[PDB]
Nucleic acid binder design. Structure first.
Length: 68
DNA sequence: GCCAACGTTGGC
DNA sequence: GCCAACGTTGGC
């Protein structure tokens, strides 16, 4: 399920999807959803949308935490 | 050797 | 044409 990510602005949720098939079966991808449902797949994609709203330079994309 | 990042595939 | 799932690799 999509769980709230406190490091990001209110309404931002993150979800982790285990791959089901193929040679990378078992690995996982992380996605974020904006307050309005829009899907982000990488830290630079989040960065382009959020801009000056929050400094994502210490943001660990995979876990959803600022790692100082 | 690993994986972030994002192109490509397959199904719709 | 859209998009979720998977392949792929340059940079580390």
């Amino acid at each position: 399920k999509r769980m709230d990510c406190p490091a990001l602005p209110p309404g931002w949720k993150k979800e982790e999807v285990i791959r089901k098939s193929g040679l990378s079966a078992g690995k996982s991808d992380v996605y974020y959803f904006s307050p309005s449902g829009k899907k982000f797949r990488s830290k630079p994609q989040l960065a382009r949308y959020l801009g000056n709203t929050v400094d994502l330079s210490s943001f660990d994309f995979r876990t959803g935490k600022m790692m100082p």
